[PDB]
Amino acid sequence: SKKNSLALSLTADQMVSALLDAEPPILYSEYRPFSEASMMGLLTNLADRELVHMINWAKRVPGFVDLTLHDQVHLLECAWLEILMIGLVWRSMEHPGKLLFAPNLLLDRNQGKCVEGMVEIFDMLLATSSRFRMMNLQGEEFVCLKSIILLNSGVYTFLSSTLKSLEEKDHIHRVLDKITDTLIHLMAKAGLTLQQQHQRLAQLLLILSHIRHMSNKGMEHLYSMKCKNVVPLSDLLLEMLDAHR
Amino acid sequence: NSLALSLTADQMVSALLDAEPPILYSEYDPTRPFSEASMMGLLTNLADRELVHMINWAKRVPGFVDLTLHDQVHLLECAWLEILMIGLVWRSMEHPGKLLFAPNLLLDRNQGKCVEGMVEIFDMLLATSSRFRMMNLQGEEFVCLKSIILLNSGVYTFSTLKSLEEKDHIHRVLDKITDTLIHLMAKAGLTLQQQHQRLAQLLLILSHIRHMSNKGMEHLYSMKCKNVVPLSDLLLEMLDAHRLH
């Protein structure tokens, strides 16, 4: 049933329920004093394990299964590090000044200096966490934002010259509109006026620009690690990185 | 205090429309064939002349003059290439398949190929221009978005109570631009649901513009480091603010 997907027929409460049920688990770190190679090894090992759970989660984002396998691959390839980072920022909301990569790996700002060039990325992630805390981001809004990242990050890098590729973009934009409806639904339910609903919607979506910025910086750093060949990267992580270059 | 918060939506639009920079011509010489160096020279010379007008324009964006010179420098340093790009995409809307860098420099992707590494950026800019065309982006929406980019892109990379008070001022101005976008959509007759859907669609494009700017910054850095073209001292400083690898 790809003509009239079930994602279009979901109510706002059923969208929120679906996304909450789809949530990946919080994985642990398999973690002696820190070094540059060990800290990056922990982070890339964690990332590689989370990537497997992300694939399962994406298949449960409403509308994502209606896409072709090729389009699903492209969306995860573009979005995967944005998705990891917004997850990280969300988990770090209640830990000001700290990044909760895992329940047993809670890194403060100064611990990012044992890896060169990582402190800038750390500061950007912390500032986003502070922003989400300042806005009192809710779990229901978080899962909407994360799904928007998945569907949006690669929607404009598609091909627009096929009769069947243009209807794939419309479906993506129709699912995206539904998630916007859902965010607005949650804000109206929380008692915000119309003016506050639109302002808060704008505020949340502008943070996605910063998340895109951080993922671009993080991709260059990851590429800088692959090149130095000092930190082991899984075959899957190497492929996800290779898709950005 | 700030006079930008007391401005109405119509007064916001009128201020931004009148603040619009001029359309500049390139130093394109039709007597010599293109090379990678000469095309990079045309594009960087044009950007350098546009930067001067951009600075004048930024000082006319409501709320911008209220900031310290340090904060003004930071915002323009973070956003300048996004601003050039959204302007380019806007100028190219009525030129399907072409980018109107200037009235005497209207290029298709095959002309972009002579600068290796630019064709990917070229393709993304065309896709953005086509998205704006399909959405039928209006001039009043365009100037709002360009001002959002200027205020948003560097806002999340600012402890002191005076710094948290200046960030709060920026977010109050961004909220006014949200109110203005919604006002424009209602005035055009969009239903309440269409208003928030279109606001989301427009703001999500800003993440692609952020993405294109990051890719463009890495390309500019490559052209500098390979001695392809000399960059003006202003372009060198705007590039160095992004601290690339």
Added chain:
Amino acid sequence: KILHRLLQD
């Protein structure tokens, strides 16, 4: 290629 195999399974 790994991502293809993961999505199908």
Added chain:
Amino acid sequence: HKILHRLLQDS
């Protein structure tokens, strides 16, 4: 004394 800082003052 960067260029941008100077240009932001002249008008």
